[PDB]
């Protein structure tokens, strides 16, 4: 009943920048039957499995907003490391840089990895559980190529491509993007019949 | 004024086991002027720098206990990785095992590391800030030696020794232990004149 109950309602998307809100609204498309409104809500970063961290974060956002809320998290997961750095990728990137992220795997033959995006939605009734929407993209960790301003994108090469996320033209990255995939699941949850 | 104000008072030590409480009480010694009482308080694990995670955790414990409280955290920090895995060591150990922890450094010449223990204390007046007490032990990450039931101890060799923490006799580990060092700072904070 969450979806139907949210048709025509404001959902707070937790972000601090309007362009990020714009991207999400465009990806969700004009039949998305809710109004997303950006708000910077201070949320702790939690340790845990990706799903637990997203739920935890969303529950904290519900405590603050006390109404419909949407949060986003993105992991980079190395298969040789059992999915790590995963939700700790921010810290590893900052310390190691794209070059060092690839160096972390020097001792492992398996360079495969996946990018993971999880969105977590609640109606803001704590009596109703958080729903998760995920997207994944399989690839491999490579010595960085492309412009380095783009987070860990220089060291991630999606399967089916000889270019890293940083190298790829935006339209090509979109076509395989873990974030687009996650947003497709959120879109599909509401369906396209209500707007 | 925190110390003096806590003389003769109950401090809740957040743990779920009586032996862990026993170890701390013995290390602090019989002139430690407060009564430590073990209680299992459910605390989230947070991401951040070691000090911020300890403060965050202690502040959450204060919200629950609303009185004097003491929490403990332990990191294993690889210098080649800018101090990582650090506060995320639990996850890395679980995924990689001691063998894989050492393998993580295959691509780096520098195998040096340090074990870090931080205790965080509050009086439980939120008007008073958390005080931290830390201890560190420098060493190197090695292919594991010794019994493997002992967390990451098999892959940590303290400086001045040709044995890992897992190999060392308990009395020897105590003499260099990061946890003992942290507890010495807590002991020194209260002093030995009040009991």
UniProtKB/Swiss-Prot annotation, chains A, B:
InterPro entries: ITPase, ITPase-like_fam, RdgB/HAM1. Its cofactor is Mg(2+). It is found in: Cytoplasm. Its EC number is 3.6.1.66. Ubiquitous. Highly expressed in heart, liver, sex glands, thyroid and adrenal gland. The modification N-acetylalanine is found at residue 3. GO terms for molecular function: dITP diphosphatase activity; identical protein binding; ITP diphosphatase activity; metal ion binding; nucleoside triphosphate diphosphatase activity; nucleotide binding; XTP diphosphatase activity. It catalyses: ITP + H2O = IMP + diphosphate + H(+); dITP + H2O = dIMP + diphosphate + H(+); XTP + H2O = XMP + diphosphate + H(+); N(6)-hydroxy-dATP + H2O = N(6)-hydroxy-dAMP + diphosphate + H(+). ITP binds at residues 15-20, 57, 73-74, 90, 150-153, 173, 178-179. One of its GO terms (biological process) is deoxyribonucleoside triphosphate catabolic process. CDD domains: HAM1 (cd00515). GO terms for cellular component: cytoplasm; cytosol; intracellular membrane-bounded organelle; nucleoplasm. Keywords: Acetylation, Cytoplasm, Disease variant, Epilepsy, Hydrolase, Magnesium, Metal-binding, Nucleotide metabolism, Nucleotide-binding. Mg(2+) binds at residue 45. Binds 1 Mg(2+) ion per subunit. Optimum pH is 10. PANTHER family: INOSINE TRIPHOSPHATE PYROPHOSPHATASE, INOSINE TRIPHOSPHATE PYROPHOSPHATASE/HAM1 PROTEIN. Homodimer. Pyrophosphatase that hydrolyzes the non-canonical purine nucleotides inosine triphosphate (ITP), deoxyinosine triphosphate (dITP) as well as 2'-deoxy-N-6-hydroxylaminopurine triphosphate (dHAPTP) and xanthosine 5'-triphosphate (XTP) to their respective monophosphate derivatives. The enzyme does not distinguish between the deoxy- and ribose forms. Probably excludes non-canonical purines from RNA and DNA precursor pools, thus preventing their incorporation into RNA and DNA and avoiding chromosomal lesions. This is Inosine triphosphate pyrophosphatase. The gene is ITPA.
């Amino acid at each position: 009943h969450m979806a139907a109950s949210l048709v025509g309602k404001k959902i707070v998307f937790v972000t601090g920048n309007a362009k990020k809100l714009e991207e999400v609204v465009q990806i969700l498309g004009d039949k998305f039957p809710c109004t997303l409104v950006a708000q910077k809500i201070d949320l702790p970063e939690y340790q845990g499995e990706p799903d637990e961290i997203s739920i935890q974060k969303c529950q904290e956002a519900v405590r603050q907003v006390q109404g419909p809320v949407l949060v986003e998290d993105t992991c980079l997961c190395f298969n040789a490391l059992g999915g790590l750095p995963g939700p700790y990728i921010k810290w590893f990137l900052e310390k190691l840089k794209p070059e060092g992220l690839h160096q972390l795997l020097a001792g492992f033959e398996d360079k495969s990895a996946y990018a993971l995006c999880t969105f977590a939605l609640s109606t803001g009734d704590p009596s109703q559980p958080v729903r998760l929407f995920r997207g994944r993209t399989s690839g491999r960790i490579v010595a960085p190529r492309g412009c380095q301003d783009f987070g860990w994108d220089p060291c991630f090469q999606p399967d089916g491509y000889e270019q890293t996320y940083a190298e790829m033209p935006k339209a090509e990255k979109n076509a395989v993007s873990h974030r687009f995939r996650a947003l497709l699941e959120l879109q599909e949850y509401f369906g396209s019949l209500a707007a």
